[model samples]
Every structure is written in C-alpha cells, then in structure tokens.
Target: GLGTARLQLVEFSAFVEPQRHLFVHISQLESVDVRQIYDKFPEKKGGLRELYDRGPPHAFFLVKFWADLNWGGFYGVSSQYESLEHMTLTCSSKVCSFGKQVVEKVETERAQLEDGRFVYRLLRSPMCEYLVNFLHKLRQLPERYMMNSVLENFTILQVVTNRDTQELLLCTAYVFEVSTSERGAQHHIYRLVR
Candidate 1:
C-alpha cells in the first residue's frame, strides 16, 4: 500500500532494437505535505517509484491507478492480448499444488541414517513444526502459501543463485524468537513475542 501516492504507467529503457519496455510509477500527490522527493537524489522524482510483481508463473504488470494520492494505488495489467482497448486477463496459478507431499520422504531418509541421525533441514524449520502441528490440530494443510503458524518461531532456508555466473549461495533467516513467556497453571507454556 502506498498510503496516498499517485500511480502511473511509465516507460522503461530498453537496449534492444525494438525498445519495448514499461514500468509502474508512483509519485507524491500535490495536496500532500512538503515531503516531495523529486530533484533530490538521482531518481529525478520519488513517491513510490516503479512496482513490479515478478513471480515464477509470469511477470505481473501494474496499472495506472491512484487511491490515496499520498499513498498511491496499484493495479494489475491484463495477461491476455488487448484488442485496442478491451483487454483480457488470464489468471494463472502460481502455486499449482495445494500443499507439499514430501513429509514422509524425510522420515524415509531419516530411517536410513544411524538410528535417525540425519539432519533434515525442512523438518527442523519452524514452518515444518507449524505444518505438522496443523495436520495434528486441523487434520489437513491449508492453502499453499497461506499456511501460517504463530505458536512457534522458526527460520527459512533458501539458496541464492546467480543465473549468469552459475553461482550458488546458501542463505537462512533465523527469526521468530520468544519475546515473552509465561507458564500456565497446569504445564503449558503461553508466550508471545513483540
């Protein structure tokens, strides 16, 4: 959310012969305060700048939209080809499958090691704990990317790769620490983080 910035469909610089390029622009509104960022830095102007949602399925383009002006609005472009004015949008599924099916695979591999001595990365993730607990508590997994568990803190591990140089780097974020904790009267731990 841009709060009230003005959004516009701008152009991008292309180095090819055709020079077909576009971008989403977000700028400050006029009725707003004296917080305009134009002519200050190298960006010529600033409010929110260009916005793009680059996903695995396709590149989603932003439309010309302005809501709050101070906090601009953003809209998606039509996926289908436009017939001059009338556009067609084809919504594609980013997450083809609902949930993962590799839980038992880890158990199978863990059984191979010396009495379950293998270090399973996914299993150790807080997300894994949330998923397993969800299965036990909710009896099924939720939507692919929407599943979230707030009871426990965890980390997400991913590999950063360079397509041109063929380089790979392992990256991880250790988060969800316990900010506050209090044991219940029985034997349960009730806590929350700030």
Candidate 2:
C-alpha cells in the first residue's frame, strides 16, 4: 500500500507557434478512489471510473489545467472534449491498457537510455496533448515500496502548434522525481516545492 504523505509534481507546457504558450504547474499529494468518483457520477459508467478500473491497482490520474473554469454546466453535464480543448490535460498510469495503446500510437522513434532510465520520445500530431497525457499516465512505478524508496520521477510533455494553420508542429516528452514531505496543519497546502 502507498503512504498517505506521497507527493508528485508535474510540469506541463503548451505552445502555439510564434510566441504563444502556456505553462502549467500541478501537484498531486493526495489520493482519490474510483468509488468516490463513481458515487458522484453513477451514470457516467463509461467515464473516469471505468477507465480507472481497467488499470492496475496502483494506478492514478494526472490532471492539469491552465485556468479555473467549469464548462461542465453549459450542457447541464460535463463534456470531456470541452475539457480537453480548454487546456485540461488528463492522464492515467501507464500500467493500463489505454497507456499501452498510447505508447504504441505515439512512439515514432525508439526509446533512448538517458540519465540511467529509458526515455521514449513520441511523434508530434494534432492530438499532441491528448497523446502525451496518455503516455504520462502509462508510466509504471515499482511493484513494491520500501521505507527508503526514493519514489521520485517526472514526465514532461510539450505541445507546439502552428498558430496560423492551427495544426500541431511538435510535441516533446522529457522524463525526470518524488519524495515524502511534511503534512501541513491544513488539509490542503497552497504551495509545494522540492
């Protein structure tokens, strides 16, 4: 089982050609169960819970967004496509089937051994953000955890599109780390750095 004090950092960048880009910072130090999500969205049988249950037990979701917006109320229901277009990048653990599909679909070149770990650089496409999010989610963690385990690693995904053509120009993936930290007095802490 994983500890309650785990923290993971995510750094994301999306670029629109000719000097337009957005960088987002996200942190995950808490856990949410599929059951809890399912309870809130019981009718969403084919959504997050289904995707989550299809993956390994240790799997989790990595979500990032540029702004705070709730377009979910527009149609009186949440729209996944709208979320994606609004700069929300949602990814899952690589141990899942979806993760495997992403790796196979996006791997244009072979993975290279960099900094001791194998790094897989993916192909660029109009769906760069979507693809990279899948790749990030697909990453696997060690099967077992030890008290001294470092548990530090990171995934970097960048999307660059042609501002004129509105087509994707490039998407890059850079791999990186996780460590335990002190629990704050409040249930949620505003800022965290390593």
Question: Best-fitting candidate, measured by TM-score?
Answer: 2
**Alpha-carbon RMSD to native, per candidate:** 23.7, 18.1
Off by over 4 Å in 2: 1-11, 23-28, 36-46, 62-64, 68-109, 127-194
Could you tell me the TM-score of candidate 2? 0.32
Q: Total backbone clashes of model 2?
A: 10
State TM-scores per candidate: 0.17, 0.32
lDDT of 2 by residue, 29-52 (tens): 444444532332222433445544
| Model 2 local distance difference test score | 0.27
The CA-based lDDT of model 1 is what?
0.19
> Which pairs in model 2 have colliding backbones?
92-137, 93-137, 94-137, 94-138, 94-139, 152-177, 152-178, 153-177, 153-178, 154-177
